[PDB]
Ligand binder design. Structure first.
Ligand code: NA
Length: 129
């Protein structure tokens, strides 16, 4: 599923991401834009052999099982394929664990490089929330 911007904003807010660990909704929408272009089916191979899955490009190195990432963990206790669903529940639940791990949203390098310190409220502009 390719979400609309406000469509994803509504879904993330419903699932309790607005101000989760102090991060406003626009931070999460901005992260999803640059990680996945709002596409639930996005997959990208990392140089270390791990893969990033779904709207928030969650890494098989720590967070989900894809069976092809040696020495990796599955800390969200989910198959990485569950992070590609049109229903973002699994991605959101797993993102709550990632952002709680100590470095907040710096875990998403695209958030740090492209969203951090920017006018992230622009990403929820015009949305009926
Ligand atoms: Na894994």
């Amino acid at each position: 599923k390719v979400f609309g911007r406000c469509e994803l904003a509504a879904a993330m807010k419903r699932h309790g991401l607005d101000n989760y660990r102090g991060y406003s909704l626009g931070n999460w929408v901005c992260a999803a834009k640059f990680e996945s272009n709002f596409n639930t089916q996005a997959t990208n191979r990392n140089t270390d052999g791990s893969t990033d899955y779904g709207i928030l490009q969650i890494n098989s190195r720590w967070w989900c099982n894809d069976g092809r990432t040696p020495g990796s963990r599955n800390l969200c206790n989910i198959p990485c394929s569950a992070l590609l669903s049109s229903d973002i529940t699994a991605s959101v639940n797993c993102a709550k664990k990632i952002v709680s791990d100590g470095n907040g949203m710096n875990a998403w390098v695209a958030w740090r490089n492209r969203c951090k310190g920017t006018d992230v409220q622009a990403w929820i502009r015009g949305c009926r929330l």
